[PDB]
Design brief:
The complex is a heterodimer of chains A (139) and B (8).
Chain A lengths: L2 E10 L13 E2 L12 E7 L10 E10 L5 E10 L5 E6 L4 E3 L4 E9 H4 L12 E10 L1
Chain B lengths: L8
The chains are: A mainly beta (139), B little secondary structure (8).
Chain lengths: 139, 8
């Protein structure tokens, strides 16, 4: 089946200053395809994981904030833009997932904190975490 | 390889 494909670049400034504890969430602004499909999406990150078993990781999800019909099927890909402006450390759905309004899908163990937070690895230029999300909605 | 999941 064909798709409508779109993207959002989320810059989280002053990332080293995040005070989020395990289970606390930051949501992005809402975004859409611009195809007037009435779908609104956002990203959400847990800097210290969804739960105790994931507290060593950032957990990253795509949330369907509002939709007109009962269900949407969509593939998704998340990557980090490094200091050289290139995509790295990407994770992508192996198939389309079924979203309804208020449902998310993503990666509970998206990136290990001990790796991300070491500035020498080039993922927090200017103390900014920049995430790039591509969404493909199945038509 | 990681698999996708939902927070709910």
């Amino acid at each position: 089946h064909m798709v409508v494909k779109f993207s959002y670049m989320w810059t989280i400034n002053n990332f080293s200053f995040c005070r989020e504890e395990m289970g606390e969430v930051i949501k992005s602004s809402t975004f859409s395809s611009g195809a007037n499909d009435k779908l609104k999406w956002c990203l959400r990150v847990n800097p210290k994981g969804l739960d105790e078993e994931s507290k060593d990781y950032l957990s990253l999800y795509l949330l369907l904030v509002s939709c007109p019909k009962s269900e949407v099927r969509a593939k998704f890909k998340f990557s980090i833009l490094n200091a050289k402006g290139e995509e790295t450390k990407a994770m992508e759905s192996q198939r389309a997932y079924r979203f309804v309004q208020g449902k998310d899908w993503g990666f509970k163990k998206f990136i290990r904190r001990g790796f991300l937070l070491d500035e020498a690895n080039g993922l927090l230029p200017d103390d900014k975490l920049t995430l790039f999300c591509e969404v493909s909605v199945v038509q | 390889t990681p698999t996708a999941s939902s927070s709910s």
